[PDB]
Design a protein around this ligand. Structure first.
Ligand SMILES: CC(C)(C)CC(C)(C)c1ccc(OCCOCCO)cc1
Ligand SMILES: CC(C)(C)CC(C)(C)c1ccc(OCCOCCO)cc1
Ligand SMILES: CCCCCCCCCCCCCC(=O)O
Ligand SMILES: *[C@@H]1O[C@H](CO)[C@@H](O)[C@H](O)[C@H]1NC(C)=O
Ligand SMILES: *[C@@H]1O[C@H](CO)[C@@H](O)[C@H](O)[C@H]1NC(C)=O
Ligand SMILES: *[C@@H]1O[C@H](CO)[C@@H](O)[C@H](O)[C@H]1NC(C)=O
Ligand SMILES: [Cl-]
Ligand SMILES: [Cl-]
Ligand SMILES: [Cl-]
Ligand SMILES: [Cl-]
Ligand SMILES: [Cl-]
Ligand SMILES: [Cl-]
Ligand SMILES: [Cl-]
Ligand SMILES: [Cl-]
Ligand SMILES: [Cl-]
Ligand SMILES: [Cl-]
Ligand SMILES: [Cl-]
Ligand SMILES: [Cl-]
Lengths: 95, 232
């Protein structure tokens, strides 16, 4: 069988294209996954500073990159800083 | 990780990879195959985790297939400066941008090789014609080495794990040799998607950290196959 198969139209605005896929997923599961990847790898104080200066961090990354993350975090009720940190989980520990 | 691009006796290019990462129990439930569309038509196919907008395994139908493996080299503060002061690109986002904008296997290997990054990585690319298969060892500024297929010379497969291919694999984490050995036994004659999938299922190439195994061929896009693994 394999994993599920979803479509993601790239003609819809970045904030809305990933939302039809999230409907199929329990919000609690995703929010627990983010908390597991961040809480285990990131100290609480680092998470604090990134949460306070998230917008300054956002102005640097590609617009369509942060726009797809932002639209999902507004749907799941997650903090945009928690969304950018998992989407940069590789760049956070790859050195 | 473990990415493998190989060429069979008749001249077809096959591509498969293993994605080894902690937090497996959670990510196996979020793994998905995503078919990004354009004007209604599939523009490319990728495998990611719900909530992760980048791609570490993708396929542009009838053009190329690309996958990424981790390359830890440098210092922590090089990723900070590369991302903040220099506005470099993430690894999983450049891999997706290429699957979307690159028009040919040659343009896909150019972007993946020259585009500045925040951190190092191994980009393993495959194609639709024979001898189209390279392993791009990336710095943050540009490419550090490009390892091409050379069948007539006795190199019909490229095995990339998480270390430079011109150096001896560490004794603690040597998933290269068993992948090579199992590819030597399979033989260039009987190389197919299912026989490649078996190579990626050989311990320790298939370890407790393996989350999913993908096998694909740019020339036969409909055969894209991902299987979530439950190691034990
Ligand atoms: C998904 C939401 C509504 C929760 C988040 C926000 C407010 C950011 C939103 C709100 C509306 C929205 O629609 C954009 C349609 O534009 C098409 C041409 O650009 C996209 C996003
Ligand atoms: C915004 C981030 C921090 C999530 C991502 C960037 C790329 C800027 C990053 C990524 C990694 C990074 O390394 C610092 C590790 O922290 C503890 C030091 O021992 C620093 C920054
Ligand atoms: C909803 C949260 C899901 C995102 C969890 C973090 C995902 C990070 C994946 C990084 C892939 C590592 C590259 C590799 O295979 O070595
Ligand atoms: C969403 O988040 C806001 C602010 O963090 C909070 O006030 C609200 O109760 C949350 N609602 C749900 C359904 O999680
Ligand atoms: C995805 O889109 C294609 C064509 O754009 C359609 O035929 C197919 O049914 C869709 N798949 C899913 C799983 O929705
Ligand atoms: C997982 O770890 C256990 C304990 O070391 C080992 O016996 C087992 O073979 C490992 N599984 C895989 C798939 O490597
Ligand atoms: Cl099967
Ligand atoms: Cl449904
Ligand atoms: Cl490993
Ligand atoms: Cl073709
Ligand atoms: Cl260095
Ligand atoms: Cl894109
Ligand atoms: Cl191009
Ligand atoms: Cl470029
Ligand atoms: Cl250079
Ligand atoms: Cl290697
Ligand atoms: Cl290295
Ligand atoms: Cl299965």
């Amino acid at each position: 069988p394999g994993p599920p198969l979803f479509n993601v139209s790239l003609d819809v605005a970045p904030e809305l294209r990933w939302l039809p896929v999230l409907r199929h997923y329990d919000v609690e599961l995703v929010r627990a996954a983010v908390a597991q990847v961040i809480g285990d790898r990131v100290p609480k104080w680092v998470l604090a500073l990134i949460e306070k200066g998230a917008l300054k961090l956002e102005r640097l990354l590609p617009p369509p990159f942060t726009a797809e993350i932002r639209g999902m975090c507004d749907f799941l009720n997650l903090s945009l800083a928690d969304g950018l940190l998992v989407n940069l989980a590789y760049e956070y520990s790859a050195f | 990780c473990t990415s493998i691009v190989a060429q069979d006796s008749r001249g077809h290019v096959y591509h498969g990879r293993n994605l080894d990462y902690p937090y497996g129990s959670i990510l196996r439930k979020l793994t998905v195959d995503v078919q990004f569309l354009k004007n209604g038509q599939i523009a490319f196919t990728g495998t990611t985790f719900i909530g992760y907008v980048g791609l570490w395994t993708g396929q542009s139908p009838h053009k190329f297939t690309v996958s990424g493996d981790e390359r830890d080299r440098g210092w922590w503060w090089e990723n900070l400066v590369a991302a903040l002061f220099l506005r470099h690109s993430p690894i999983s986002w450049l891999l997706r941008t290429t699957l979307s904008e690159a028009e040919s296997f040659e343009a896909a290997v150019y972007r993946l090789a020259k585009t500045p990054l925040i951190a190092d990585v191994y980009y393993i690319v495959g194609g639709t014609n024979p001898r189209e298969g390279v392993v791009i060892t990336r710095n943050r500024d540009g490419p550090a080495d490009i390892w091409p297929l050379d069948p007539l010379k006795g190199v019909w497969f490229l095995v990339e794990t998480n270390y430079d291919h011109w150096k001896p694999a560490p004794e603690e984490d040597d998933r290269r040799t068993p992948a090579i050995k199992a590819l030597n036994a399979t033989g260039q004659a009987k190389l197919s998607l299912e026989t490649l999938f078996q190579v990626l299922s050989v311990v320790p190439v298939y370890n407790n950290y393996t989350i999913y195994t993908t096998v694909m061929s740019a020339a036969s896009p409909d055969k894209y196959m991902t299987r979530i693994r439950n190691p034990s």
